[PDB]
């Protein structure tokens, strides 16, 4: 009841599922976080690093080498 149950993974997942193409570059994911949250626009080193590790470590986030540039997707199972 102090904090919502959100994690970086669930927020990254909402950002990817909110787009019609269901894919986002790391930079687009960054801009989504800065649009959504006022604090993320202020200070940047710690949260951007957490976002990168969540994309990398979680198997449900898949990096696709799209010809226009690498994008991140969600692949449950
Ligand atoms: Na991953």
Q: Give 54 Cα–ligand 1 centroid separation in angstroms.
A: 7
Q: Give 72 Cα–ligand 1 centroid separation in angstroms.
A: 9
State how far the Cα of 36 lies from the Cα of 56, in Å rounded to an integer: 22
Q: What are phi and psi of 61, to 5 degrees?
A: -105, 120
- Domain map of the chain by residue range? 1-77
Query: How distant, in Å, are the alpha carbons of 1, 15, 21, 43, 46 from that of 18?
Result: 26, 5, 9, 25, 24
Q: Give 55 Cα–ligand 1 centroid separation in angstroms.
A: 5
Give the technique used to solve this structure: X-ray
Resolution of this structure in Å: 2.2
Compute and round to an integer the Cα radius of gyration of the chain.
13
């Amino acid at each position: 009841d102090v904090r919502p149950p959100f994690t970086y993974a669930s927020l990254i997942r909402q950002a990817i599922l909110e787009t019609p193409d269901r894919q986002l570059t790391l930079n687009e994911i960054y801009n989504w976080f800065t649009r959504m949250f006022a604090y993320f626009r202020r200070n940047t080193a710690t949260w951007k690093n957490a976002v990168r590790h969540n994309l990398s470590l979680h198997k449900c986030f898949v990096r696709v080498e799209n010809v226009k540039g690498a994008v991140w997707t969600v692949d449950e199972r």
